Write an enzyme that holds these catalytic residues in place. Structure first.
Site, PDB file in Angstrom:
ATOM      1  N   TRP C  32       0.589  -0.691   0.022  1.00 25.23           N
ATOM      2  CA  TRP C  32      -0.112   0.152  -0.018  1.00 25.23           C
ATOM      3  C   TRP C  32       0.731   1.214   0.297  1.00 25.23           C
ATOM      4  O   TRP C  32       1.594   1.584   1.063  1.00 25.23           O
ATOM      5  CB  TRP C  32      -1.146   0.069   0.871  1.00 25.23           C
ATOM      6  CG  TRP C  32      -1.895  -1.431   1.418  1.00 25.23           C
ATOM      7  CD1 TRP C  32      -3.078  -1.261   0.351  1.00 25.23           C
ATOM      8  CD2 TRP C  32      -1.308  -2.551   1.745  1.00 25.23           C
ATOM      9  NE1 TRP C  32      -3.142  -2.418   0.524  1.00 25.23           N
ATOM     10  CE2 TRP C  32      -3.027  -3.264   1.525  1.00 25.23           C
ATOM     11  CE3 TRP C  32      -0.881  -3.057   2.935  1.00 25.23           C
ATOM     12  CZ2 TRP C  32      -2.839  -4.943   2.632  1.00 25.23           C
ATOM     13  CZ3 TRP C  32      -1.159  -4.376   3.004  1.00 25.23           C
ATOM     14  CH2 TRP C  32      -1.465  -4.885   2.740  1.00 25.23           C
ATOM     15  N   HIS C  61      -7.723   1.332   1.705  1.00 27.74           N
ATOM     16  CA  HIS C  61      -8.547   0.763   1.397  1.00 27.74           C
ATOM     17  C   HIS C  61     -10.010   1.105   2.532  1.00 27.74           C
ATOM     18  O   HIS C  61      -9.329   1.440   3.463  1.00 27.74           O
ATOM     19  CB  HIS C  61      -7.898  -1.228   1.829  1.00 27.74           C
ATOM     20  CG  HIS C  61      -7.090  -1.517   2.937  1.00 27.74           C
ATOM     21  ND1 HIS C  61      -6.738  -2.937   2.818  1.00 27.74           N
ATOM     22  CD2 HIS C  61      -6.323  -0.261   3.706  1.00 27.74           C
ATOM     23  CE1 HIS C  61      -5.882  -3.025   3.685  1.00 27.74           C
ATOM     24  NE2 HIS C  61      -6.283  -1.826   4.600  1.00 27.74           N
ATOM     25  N   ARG C  87      -3.978   6.338  -2.380  1.00 29.60           N
ATOM     26  CA  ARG C  87      -2.900   5.319  -2.767  1.00 29.60           C
ATOM     27  C   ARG C  87      -1.819   6.350  -3.395  1.00 29.60           C
ATOM     28  O   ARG C  87      -2.002   7.134  -4.625  1.00 29.60           O
ATOM     29  CB  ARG C  87      -2.622   3.787  -3.916  1.00 29.60           C
ATOM     30  CG  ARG C  87      -3.981   2.984  -2.869  1.00 29.60           C
ATOM     31  CD  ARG C  87      -2.965   2.489  -1.556  1.00 29.60           C
ATOM     32  NE  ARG C  87      -4.507   1.131  -1.699  1.00 29.60           N
ATOM     33  CZ  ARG C  87      -4.630  -0.290  -2.105  1.00 29.60           C
ATOM     34  NH1 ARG C  87      -4.328   0.220  -3.774  1.00 29.60           N
ATOM     35  NH2 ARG C  87      -5.184  -0.743  -2.093  1.00 29.60           N
ATOM     36  N   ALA C 197     -13.727 -12.366   4.206  1.00 31.98           N
ATOM     37  CA  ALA C 197     -14.186 -11.202   3.647  1.00 31.98           C
ATOM     38  C   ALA C 197     -13.881 -11.524   2.841  1.00 31.98           C
ATOM     39  O   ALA C 197     -12.734 -12.333   2.021  1.00 31.98           O
ATOM     40  CB  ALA C 197     -13.317  -9.941   4.724  1.00 31.98           C
TER      41      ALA C 197
END
Ligand code: MG
Lengths: 266, 785, 233
Positions: C32, C61, C87, C197
């Site tokens: 990230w 995120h 980002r 998830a």
């Protein structure tokens, strides 16, 4: 100087009918439980409205529905698969026929909800109408049991009236379900049990009608080893006690002073 | 990571094909970015032995005399053309991939060159072009075609995730494929050691940054070019071959994700010392750059008496001085585990990224050092005929991996699968784990090279990837949600209807970046931004927006320049940052307006925007009102505050002309509010079935008096029976007492239970007339039918 | 049966990285490209309205919201959290620094990977039809184990589309949730549960579904672009 408080140009602002609001509220509740909304015709044939749903000629049950019969030449009523369906015409007394129309044209498993306008020959008063709306559901599949029926209505109660809501079921009779039942919801803020509707497990004879008719049209049978439950409820009843409408006659009364009050309701 | 097919195939001998290998690796968790084919060597390229090299007088060129089956001569200016080596000769007529031209016999400084010796680049086997390819003198019979010793190769470019550092070595990848069922051929360390003392010592001054260090001893070395097989392998791996010993160290690193380095004893002194760098300590690393070590840089250093000099940057890069060259005869082999964090920081610090640092950051087998020594030493003995000492110098003692409890039942319970107990344990065993116990809960201890295997879940993923994710069945869950999750979406739903109602009315949605130019806080006259970025994409994107409108206004201009819209009505819902993060709603109207296209009379500007807003608010069923108030960015004469349900939520007005001027824009009207708007429940009011009573009346008011104040007055006084109150005429001029205006109002009184008596309306319109004059207002008209 | 809940765009390093098993100086953190923030007098408030302390950043995120939800609610439940994420990247025809993701989370007694494969299956069927099929492969994420990436067989495009990631919530994520719940005085609730998830990019779908060639159009604000989508409901 420009006066900002002066009324601006008067564009119109719309609104939705109390019944559309209520109907929408019930369909989204069931959509969250995986139910799809499908509609059916208002003008039906006696076969789909009575015969297929185990309600035959000269039978006590037929007395539960005050039918408006129809006459008219040159009107084409078409069945599930676009076929010309032959029968004595009538205005539907409930949405249930659509559940037979669906079953003949689709294969299990599935979950459906069919909202609709229904008619009954009655004398219109503050709590009685000849034209009103119902909403019926149907879930069919391998292993569907009454526990699943109680679960659905439980979810309906929780969604309409909160976590402190509870449902109650009691035996009642319907020609098209066995077991059969009537359900009531504990409306905690009204401090009283509300009788909402009926439900039960689809009757063996309804599935036989479906398949037999499927076979007639060349479709293989699909309801041999399935079970299923169905429920049905009145919309006006909810709409009134939920929006506080005192007279059922307002719904079709078309008074702008009545309808405009429901502009803010989404 | 370039995974050269024929090389991996040496461990997993049964591989079907690169295409299948790619498919196999996908399911194990490794995705290949590409598959290249690489050594298309012409038949015109042959292997030749350089018999002698003669310099051409007055030039920097040399005349190599080659035994290429027949004795030929070639001219070359390569810094490394010298007798006693094998070269790749491109016979005249040869079309080269690398130099894209045709090789021919040619006259160069008096000597006729029969073709040309090639560099890694000209042959197309590598990027390097600073020198001839150097093969061992006797690699092949002079003349025999290179293709025959150097076949094409298929190379897969794999993506190797951070959790699998062991996959940064071909043997690592080989052990995975082995769990699938392939045969594993592990190479053996054929060593013939001899018991003798090590001529140097080891001193680890920081066991925190070098938890396991080992040194090996090799002597009697004969440094030469590597065997063709090792040259091909390295080139395919994306690496360039240097010589005998340095290549062994690159080969074994790739083989097992264990970087290692050979130091020429000549430069070691009395021994190796792993320690931190001293302030201002310098090092000329292999790359040729003379760097300046930082006190936090781990360093491999050698000492002599009381001097300690840097030999290399630990686990990152070695010094250029101690590098193994031609005259080197004995070396010290470094093979260790360094702390990831330390190596990481030092690597970033010096802007270095090497195959060594890369693997040390991700991690290395805490117990693979010794085995790596035996492998490299063994090869050195085999390739450079080295004599190897038996003993190794070892610092550190890492504890083996700890056992993990495994319940096959739970594996299946979590995946929703039903792989049999036995079948699961066999997977674990094929992977190298040692399983103890009889069940139901096993004690599974992972191999030392699987740094990723620590919890039971880790182990269940192993059963899954080896069985295949495809084997996990499909299913849907059924449950009643816990009570506090009920109604949890009301908010999201409320805002989504707002957007829908807005687009319904006629507003066009716009998305705008969250970033703001700090300078804009000035251009628009707003307080400065509260959140600024430390690493902005650009200066104009250096802050987080405090308001929404500035952005809408810019996209408006941008549109006008690109296309010339005659009008626009936009809206945006988005986050705004100031003290707290909050959601806002903002819109803007600009252009000609609404009306008949083929006519000039139009509805536009302020009162049109205010219209769309009143319309919007009736749909949401809320009370909306605008009181005048100034705002820095708004236009003084057309500026007001929005009052939803009695509370100030934002503004509405015309853009301040000066801001308009600076930005070269026509006038624009806009508004900005803070969501979520108040929520007002339904209070059904049964309408009266009895007739309303009408009445008209005008109020004379001094010009400056706001219409809203008058309206409130008439309303508050009209009584409980007022139903509607509306303004139908706004007049000011003769014969109205100058400096005054008149407001015409249509009123409607209605009594719920019964019809109103005229005296009721009359008396009621009197309460209005009374308080109307008590405020100092006159009555231009009243009681008009 | 999934409910949509939104979260804040400006987050704290704890909820965005630490609670989701992505610690300091760790390879994972490199996945990230974070935009860090500085600013005095800004109040970031945690799940229960508490002042949460950490180094501020723009979320990379939507996952943090899943921790915020878990600390404030008790299982079982099913949620979907759509959101804008950031980002640090160089914006090109297929890369943006500001875009949107959608992540889901189902937690309860007995939730298994089979249920995860089932959900994504239903997603594929709904977006691309009955003749659609999903594919799962192993991949790594610090906050799930097993972990996977999923692709959908888009029958009309005749090719597999890589849509997103998913996996079973990591043991350490539940421990973080409870430990933090305990810190605030709430009893722990994630001791005997499992959960899965998944998360996916919206622009990617939106482009291939509406046929938008350049990801830069989305935030470009050109009326000639936006107006084309008036008819889409
Ligand atoms: Mg793993």
């Amino acid at each position: 100087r420009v006066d900002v408080s002066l009324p601006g140009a008067s564009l119109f602002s719309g609104g939705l009918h109390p019944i559309t609001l209520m109907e929408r509220e019930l369909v989204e509740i069931f959509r969250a439980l995986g139910y799809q909304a499908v509609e059916g015709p208002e003008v039906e044939s006696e076969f789909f409205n009575f015969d297929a749903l185990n309600i035959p000629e000269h039978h006590p049950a037929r007395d539960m529905w005050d039918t408006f019969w129809l006459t008219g030449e040159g009107f084409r009523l078409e069945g599930p698969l676009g076929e010309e369906v032959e029968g004595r015409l009538l205005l539907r007394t409930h949405t249930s026929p659509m559940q037979v129309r669906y079953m003949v044209a689709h294969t299990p498993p599935f979950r459906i909800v069919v909202p609709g306008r229904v008619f009954r020959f009655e004398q219109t008063d503050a709590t009685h109408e000849a034209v009103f709306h119902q909403l019926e559901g149907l879930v069919v599949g391998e292993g569907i049991a009454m526990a699943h029926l109680k679960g659905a209505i439980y979810e309906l109660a929780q969604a309409l009236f909160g976590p402190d809501s509870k449902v109650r079921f009691q035996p009642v009779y319907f020609p098209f379900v066995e077991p059969g039942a009537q359900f009531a919801v504990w409306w905690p803020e009204g401090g009283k049990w509300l009788e909402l509707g009926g439900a039960g497990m689809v009757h063996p004879k309804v599935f036989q009608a479906v398949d037999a008719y499927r076979e007639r049209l060349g479709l293989p049978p699909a309801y041999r080893g399935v079970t299923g439950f169905a429920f049905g409820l009145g919309v006006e009843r909810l709409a009134m006690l939920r929006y506080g409408i005192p007279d059922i006659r307002y719904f079709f009364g078309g008074r702008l002073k009545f309808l405009e009050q429901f502009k803010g309701v989404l | 990571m370039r995974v050269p097919f024929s090389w991996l195939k040496a461990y997993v001998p049964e591989l079907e094909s690169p295409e299948v290998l790619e498919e196999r690796l996908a399911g194990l968790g490794f995705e290949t970015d590409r598959i290249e084919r690489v050594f298309p060597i012409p038949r015109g390229v042959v292997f030749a032995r350089v018999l002698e090299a003669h310099p051409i007088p007055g030039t920097r060129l040399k005349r190599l005399v080659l035994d290429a089956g027949r004795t030929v001569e070639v001219v070359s200016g390569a810094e490394n053309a010298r007798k006693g080596i094998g070269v790749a000769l491109a016979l005249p007529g040869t079309e080269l991939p690398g130099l894209g031209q045709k090789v021919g016999e040619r006259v160069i400084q008096g000597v006729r060159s029969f073709g040309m010796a090639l560099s890694p680049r000209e042959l197309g086997v590598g990027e390097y072009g600073g020198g001839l390819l150097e093969f061992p003198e006797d690699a092949l019979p002079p003349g025999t075609p290179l293709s025959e010793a150097w076949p094409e190769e298929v190379v897969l470019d794999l993506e190797v995730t951070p959790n699998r550092p062991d996959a940064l070595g071909l043997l690592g990848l080989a052990r995975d494929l082995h769990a699938l069922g392939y045969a594993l051929v592990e190479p053996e360390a054929a060593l013939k050691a001899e018991a003798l003392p090590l001529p140097f010592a080891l001193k680890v001054e920081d066991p925190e940054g070098a938890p396991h260090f080992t040194l090996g001893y090799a002597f009697g070395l004969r440094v030469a070019p590597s065997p063709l097989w090792m040259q091909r392998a390295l080139f395919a791996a994306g690496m360039r071959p240097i010589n005998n010993v340095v290549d062994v160290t690159n080969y074994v690193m790739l083989e097992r994700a264990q970087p290692m380095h050979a130091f020429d004893l000549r430069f070691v002194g009395e021994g190796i010392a792993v320690r931190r760098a001293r302030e201002g300590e310098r090092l000329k690393t292999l790359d040729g750059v003379e760097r300046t070590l930082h006190p936090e840089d781990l360093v491999i250093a050698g000492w002599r008496g009381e001097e300690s000099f840097p030999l290399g940057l630990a686990g990152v890069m070695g010094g250029a001085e101690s590098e193994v060259r031609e005259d080197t005869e004995a070396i010290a082999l470094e093979v260790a585990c360094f702390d990831p964090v330390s190596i990481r920081k030092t690597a970033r610090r010096h802007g270095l990224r090497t195959e060594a640092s890369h693997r040390f950051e991700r991690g290395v087998d805490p117990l693979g050092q010794v085995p790596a020594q035996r492998r490299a030493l063994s090869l050195l003995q085999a390739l450079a005929g080295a004599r190897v000492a038996e003993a190794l110098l070892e610092a550190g003692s890492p504890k083996p991996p700890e056992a993990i409890p495994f319940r096959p039942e739970y594996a299946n319970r979590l995946l929703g699968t039903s792989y049999p107990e036995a079948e699961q344990i066999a997977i674990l065993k094929r992977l190298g784990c040692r399983v103890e116990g009889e069940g139901p809960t096993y004690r599974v201890t992972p191999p030392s090279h699987r740094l990723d295997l620590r919890l039971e879940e880790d182990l269940v993923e192993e059963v899954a990837r080896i069985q295949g994710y495809e084997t996990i069945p499909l299913a849907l869950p059924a449950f009643f949600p816990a009570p506090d999750n009920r109604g949890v979406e009301a908010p999201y739903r409320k805002e989504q209807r707002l957007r829908e109602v807005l687009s319904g009315l006629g507003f066009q949605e716009v998305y705008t970046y969250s970033f703001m130019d700090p300078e804009d806080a000035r251009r628009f006259r707003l307080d400065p931004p509260r959140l600024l970025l430390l690493n902005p994409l650009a200066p104009e994107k250096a802050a987080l927006r405090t308001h929404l409108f500035p952005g809408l206004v810019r996209v408006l201009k941008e549109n006008l320049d690109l296309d010339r819209p005659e009008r626009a009505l936009l809206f945006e819902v988005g986050r705004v940052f100031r003290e707290r993060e909050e959601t806002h709603l903002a819109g803007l109207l600009f252009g000609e307006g609404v009306g008949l296209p083929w006519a000039k009379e139009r509805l536009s500007g302020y009162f049109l925007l205010k219209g769309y807003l009143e319309a919007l608010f009736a749909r949401l069923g809320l009370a909306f009102r605008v009181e005048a108030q100034a705002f820095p960015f708004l236009h003084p004469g057309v500026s007001g505050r929005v009052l939803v349900e009695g509370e100030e939520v934002g503004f509405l007005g015309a853009l301040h002309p000066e801001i308009a001027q600076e930005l070269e824009l026509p006038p624009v009207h806009l508004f900005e509010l803070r969501l979520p708007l108040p929520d007002k429940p339904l209070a059904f009011q049964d309408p009266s079935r009895h007739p309303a009573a009408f009445r008209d009346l005008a109020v004379v008011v001094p010009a400056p008096t706001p219409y809203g104040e008058v309206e409130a007055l008439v309303r508050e006084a009209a009584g409980p029976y007022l139903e509607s109150l509306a303004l139908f005429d706004l007049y000011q001029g003769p014969p109205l007492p100058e400096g005054h205006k008149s407001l015409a109002f249509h009123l409607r009184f209605r009594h719920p239970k019964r019809t109103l008596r005229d005296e009721e309306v009359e008396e009621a319109v009197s309460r209005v007339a009374e308080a109307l004059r008590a405020r100092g207002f006159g009555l231009r008209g009243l009681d008009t039918p």
